[PDB]
Homo-oligomer: A and B are copies of this chain.
Amino acid sequence: TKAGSLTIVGTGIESIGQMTLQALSYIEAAAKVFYCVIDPATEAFILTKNKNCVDLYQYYDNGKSRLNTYTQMSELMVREVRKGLDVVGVFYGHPGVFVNPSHRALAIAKSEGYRARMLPGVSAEDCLFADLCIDPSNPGCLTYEASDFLIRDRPVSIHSHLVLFQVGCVGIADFNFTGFDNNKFGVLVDRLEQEYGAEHPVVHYIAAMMPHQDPVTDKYTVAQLREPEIAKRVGGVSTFYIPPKARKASNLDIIRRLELLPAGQVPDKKARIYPANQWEPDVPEVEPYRPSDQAAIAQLADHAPPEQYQPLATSKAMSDVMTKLALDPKALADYKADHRAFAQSVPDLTPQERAALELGDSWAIRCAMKNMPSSLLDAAFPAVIVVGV
């Protein structure tokens, strides 16, 4: 193992709070931190967590190709990796979602034989789902960069969600500190009119970046985007959400092959699961408390945990060590280097807990931390599926 590693992490969108615990722990552990964030409170927070930080944002410039900036950003990180340092790169949101220099730097580090990993973060699209109250599952999600969407004539589905990033810099490859002169925005609007019609809704979405702010969730018709007062509101942190125009019908062959038949009464294409998408035009009211819902709720009074449910049955020592492995990158490295030596050094573990850590197998650890009922193991593996469409 060569000295030197690159770990790229995110900060999420909303200041500080949307950073993951592991992003924070790696920032603290790093020999050197390179960051590219928008809000100053997140920047200030990062600087309190590591004494050796460099702002990558200073490598942008007016009329300077963003591609040249990205090469430089990547090279600054990889240079420090080559010197043998544990380097952390920090990008706002998810660091691999609409981000060039992270993928570049990691690929170079990997190709030169250094440890390289991206830790996922909360993207603007994650925020969009939360704030617009939609689920990519229902009814599928198409996500594009706005210029790419136009230039390569990327397909839309009128029956699925559409999310467009970078709608504030349509056709612009460079940078200006005072913002983009988004003069080709009308080209995007023409495409949206062709695909959806002039009266179809488009949600202008800006996630709150500070904890006390509300998101921008402004619905406009496609036609309204041509109004100069509306178009000028679209900036560098603007994303568009375009809801579906209609519900798609079910395929009879698939209904048959999946054996969803009974008497033929699969629900209608508009027989929606509550709640309906509130952005979709002319969506009918969906009843939250149907007779089936009421009957399910009536069963709560007599509910008991099923015999195959596996209650948590762990110990402070085991919870402590699993927490430490998640929150202390140095402890994790030590454990990964020698499971046995690490496991045997952890105080207060039971024999089963020690053995499970010695092995490292997910099953053994799960087994040490949950009571597995005899009924369960006699029948016949994580299984947590929380969507039913």
Q: How many copies does the complex hold?
A: 2
The stretch of A196-204, A220-228, A248-256, A344-352 in contact with B is A248-256
A211 near B332 with CB under 8 A, answer: yes
Verify if A29 is at the interface (C-beta below 8 Å from B). no
Supposing A179-B381, A237-B382, A382-B236 touch, asked if A143 and B141 sit within 8 A by C-beta, the answer is yes
Apart from A41-B319, A187-B257, list 13 A-B contacts with CB within 8 A. A17-B21, A20-B20, A22-B211, A40-B369, A41-B365, A97-B135, A118-B131, A139-B148, A154-B159, A166-B385, A175-B385, A179-B383, A184-B257
Q: How far is the CA of A335 from the CA of B212 in the complex (A)?
A: 8
Q: Least Cβ distance of A110 to chain B in Å? A: 8
Q: How far is the CA of A20 from the CA of B384 in the complex (A)?
A: 20
Verify if A86 is at the interface (C-beta below 8 Å from B). no
Residues of B contacting A14 in the complex (Cβ-Cβ under 8 angstroms): 22, 326
Interface size bucket, A side? Answer: 35 or more
- Identify which of residues 12-67 in chain A touch chain B, using a CB-to-CB cut-off of 8 Å: 12-22, 24-25, 36-41, 43-45, 47-48, 55, 57-62, 65-67
A20 near B18 with CB under 8 A, answer: yes
Verify if A322 is at the interface (C-beta below 8 Å from B). yes
Verify if A258 is at the interface (C-beta below 8 Å from B). yes
Q: How far is the CA of A258 from the CA of B253 in the complex (A)?
A: 44
B157 near A336 with CB under 8 A, answer: no
Residues of B contacting A322 in the complex (Cβ-Cβ under 8 angstroms): 15-16, 41, 44-45, 210
A175 near B97 with CB under 8 A, answer: no
Q: How far is the CA of A16 from the CA of B117 in the complex (A)?
A: 18
A258 near B20 with CB under 8 A, answer: no
B20 near A17 with CB under 8 A, answer: yes
Q: Least Cβ distance of A75 to chain B in Å? A: 5
- Identify which of residues 331-365 in chain A touch chain B, using a CB-to-CB cut-off of 8 Å: 332, 335-336, 360, 362, 365
Q: Show 13 A/B contacts (Cβ-Cβ < 8 Å), sorted by A.
A: A15-B322, A16-B21, A18-B20, A57-B309, A96-B130, A107-B274, A140-B142, A151-B260, A154-B157, A171-B258, A171-B259, A178-B376, A212-B335
Residues of B contacting A308 in the complex (Cβ-Cβ under 8 angstroms): 62, 177-178
Verify if A389 is at the interface (C-beta below 8 Å from B). yes
Q: How far is the CA of A106 from the CA of B135 in the complex (A)?
A: 13
Q: Least Cβ distance of A135 to chain B in Å? A: 6
Verify if A243 is at the interface (C-beta below 8 Å from B). no
A277-307 toward B: CB 8 Å interface, digit per residue (1/0)? 0000000000010001100110110010110
Residues of B contacting A153 in the complex (Cβ-Cβ under 8 angstroms): 248, 251, 254
Supposing A175-B383, A326-B41, A369-B41 touch, asked if A142 and B145 sit within 8 A by C-beta, the answer is no
Residues of B contacting A369 in the complex (Cβ-Cβ under 8 angstroms): 40-41, 44
Supposing A17-B327, A236-B383, A385-B236 touch, asked if A306 and B100 sit within 8 A by C-beta, the answer is no
B133 near A103 with CB under 8 A, answer: yes
A137 near B177 with CB under 8 A, answer: no
